[PDB]
Amino acid sequence: SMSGRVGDLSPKQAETLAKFRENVQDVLPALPNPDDYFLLRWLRARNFDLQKSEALLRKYMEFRKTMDIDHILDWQPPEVIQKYMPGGLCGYDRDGCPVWYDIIGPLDPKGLLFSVTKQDLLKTKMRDCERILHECDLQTERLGKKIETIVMIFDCEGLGLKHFWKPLVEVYQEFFGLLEENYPETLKFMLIVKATKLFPVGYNLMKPFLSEDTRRKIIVLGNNWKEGLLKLISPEELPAQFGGTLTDPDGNPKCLTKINYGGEIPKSMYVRDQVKTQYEHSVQINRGSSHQVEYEILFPGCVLRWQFSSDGADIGFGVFLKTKMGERQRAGEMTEVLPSQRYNAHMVPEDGNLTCSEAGVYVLRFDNTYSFVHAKKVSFTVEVLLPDEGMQKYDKELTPV
Helix, strand or coil: CCCCECCECCHHHHHHHHHHHHHCCCCHHHCCCCCHHHHHHHHHHCCCCHHHHHHHHHHHHHHHHHCCHHHHHHCCCCHHHHHHCCEEEEEECCCCCEEEEEECCCCCHHHHHCCCCHHHHHHHHHHHHHHHHHHHHHHHHHHCCCCCCEEEEEECCCCCHHHHCHHHHHHHHHHHHHHHHHCCCCEEEEEEECCECCHHHHHHHHHHHCCHHHHCCEEECCCCHHHHHHHHCCHHHCEHHHCCCECCCCCCCCCCCCCECCCCCCHHHCCCCCCCCCCCEEEEEECCCEEEEEEEECCCCCEEEEEEECCCCCEEEEEEEECCCCCCCCHHHCEEEEEEEEECCCCCCEEEEEECCCCEEEEEEEECCCCCCCEEEEEEEEEEECCCHHHHCCHHHCECC
């Protein structure tokens, strides 16, 4: 079989290329380098189907306009992103392919999304797409061989419940979706290092946004992850932080000159205290009454996630565990999970989550015991975030928490 790459095309692939081009006659005037290489990414992504490859390319032309890709290398992100958005482009693998780091642990999710918008974050990620593509083009020049694929490293140390706040999850979802739509056939490997026991839930949140091609390229490294990275990346190209010998000019092993390590964003940089949201349910509760919902959990390891808002007085909220569905239980008859407390959910919504570490029926209960009024409207959403079953197979090498 032929791989559908320049210098390795079958007669059919070549004829399909020559045709697709004839065909993408009217959009080509807009591109900086529509070489055979460029066209063939689209074709490979859709198995050389002319109509699907064309439709995919045409959508990308629209993305170019929406994101102003023509000028994006000159676009300056907000200072909060420059200073506190983790990751960066650093080094090249053993084959010449550029490496892109993300450092998930120290991300401040609310700090970021209360300081900048989802669109500023996504535009920054697309700017980094365009920067790493330019590194591919420059490596091609340097090495005398075609470089058009990249290595993504996700340092998942410290991946935890804070990261499952829905607005942050949505940024990452949209980012992976943008890569699939606009950067097909660009990924060499996505390497997951130091993943925690929460990785299967996190991955399942992203999975719907990953192509089958991408999913086959995801490698979950274990305890010997430094050796694993060194198999792919020479020590002189791999930060000492990640097992190599590359440092900043001053010797810092973190390579801070190229890789950001996040951190807590100063509250003085915030532009808002909440993001807009809609709720799945709204209920009216009586003075001194309660309202609850119940989830029958058979398979431990899923994450229960909630958000609520209520005008007026504070509202009570807690989570309890009982053995099976049945008539209403008193708090003291159930296993406390999250003991009830008083929350001000009027100025800003309350959100939270927890890991369901035992099978049973989880009861999320609102207690209206703080209004000096007749009754009370509570708006809320509760979701269960399931673990990816295939990734639970790595459980023994995933770090607690």
